[model samples]
Target: MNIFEMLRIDEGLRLKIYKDTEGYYTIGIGHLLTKSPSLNAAKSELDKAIGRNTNGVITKDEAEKLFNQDVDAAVRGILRNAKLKPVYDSLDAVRRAAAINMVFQMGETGVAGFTNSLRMLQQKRWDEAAVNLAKSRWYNQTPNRAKRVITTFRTGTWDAYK
Candidate 1:
């Protein structure tokens, strides 16, 4: 058995374009429809290949190829973002993951809006950062997740809320 076979089994081959669990248009395993231009292009390609304008489908190999490229771009974006690279490099894996996760959820500019929290994190004032994080709209919107992030900030440990 090959690695692509394993990936196909894990992701499950979907022959038609449809929304995934998150409501994003996905097809051929787990390829998400991100940008409209690219998505349109993909759809066009699919249409040309299948000789129809129906939903669209991709082979597992095509999906895996797209997934790999998308993953690389995402990784490079995280590494390239000036606001994220510093803390990402300085923190442990879990804390780093938390930071990136926040950025992913709120976007780099949105997370940057928390100036005080970012400053505290940069200054190594963990408790202050946690407080600032807790006192945000993000916290209000999602208290449990925010608290876990606060705990990670305060303790510098993966055991958030412990």
Candidate 2:
């Protein structure tokens, strides 16, 4: 399945201004940006800082485009991490998407720290691997999203994609 269908639900689409859990200025499907975006890679994809109502709004179409780009960044970051590829390759498609979704929010380095969890995943110990997420600070922040991801690991299906 196209991962966007599920991510759009988890991340949510918003043209207006919103801040992330860390209080960073965010917009359109959790797109984080500073007042002066210096991301050379994203220079063309994003311009200017998105403030509150003062910054006005972005079109739905533009938001959709940005979502795809950020999602692209997520997956590429996973691949670029190198250490994850072996374990990622060992997973099923649903599990891969689950892992990618995890990386989408946390980035590779954040997830890479889960040594025990990644090991459980590689060993196909779904329940145990998922339990590791339950014990995380991230689970406290986004329990719903984390549960859905945990379900994917446990069931190896997209039953909770909604």
Candidate 3:
């Protein structure tokens, strides 16, 4: 069986959000995103799939395909950004995941523009990095998510997301 099928069998399918082993909101055979659909590209994908009328349904198979595509694109962008700026390489996986998640929320260019946050993170100034994250339009629009990112960066723990 393919990896997707293996995960689907092991994790079980759920069209809706359910807490994972770590108690974080997850869905669709173990897929998880730090941002909600309302703030991510998934919103546009769903809108395009069903139109602006908001009166349609899509199969789980279809969503999985789109999700994979989106994830691949985001990961590529993340890699490019890291390659372009070696400083990003200093971040641990958790912080790197935070960066990729931010890219999902606000395209790569937008996340890359957070110069102060990037510098703070590179310098290992945890609280300053969190503060820099909070000082942004994204934070104003998504306070809870900003707080979660801040806490995660500050603490280096995914538990902050839960």
TM-score leader? 2
Local distance difference test scores for all models = 0.62, 0.77, 0.61
Better of 1 and 3 by TM-score: 3
How does model 1 score by TM-score?
0.54
Q: Write the per-residue lDDT of candidate 3 for residues 38-94, one digit (tens) a residue.
A: 433444444564344322234587558655665567668867875325655788777
Candidate 2 residue lDDT tens string, 61-99 = 778877888888888887777778778889888888888
Q: What is the TM-score of each candidate against the true structure?
A: 0.54, 0.84, 0.63
Clashes, model 1 = 0
In model 2, state the lDDT of residue 95.
Answer: 87
Clashing pairs for model 3 are none
lDDT of 1 by residue, 1-162 (tens): 222332343346577776654455566655555434456766766665445675576666666666565444544566887876666677765566567556544556777678778777877888778887888878897677677667767876656533
Winner on TM-score between 1 and 2 is: 2
Indicate whether candidate 1 or candidate 3 has the larger lDDT: 1
> Positional deviation of 156 in candidate 3, in angstroms?
0.9
- Off-target runs (Cα >4 Å) in candidate 2 are 35-46, 49-56
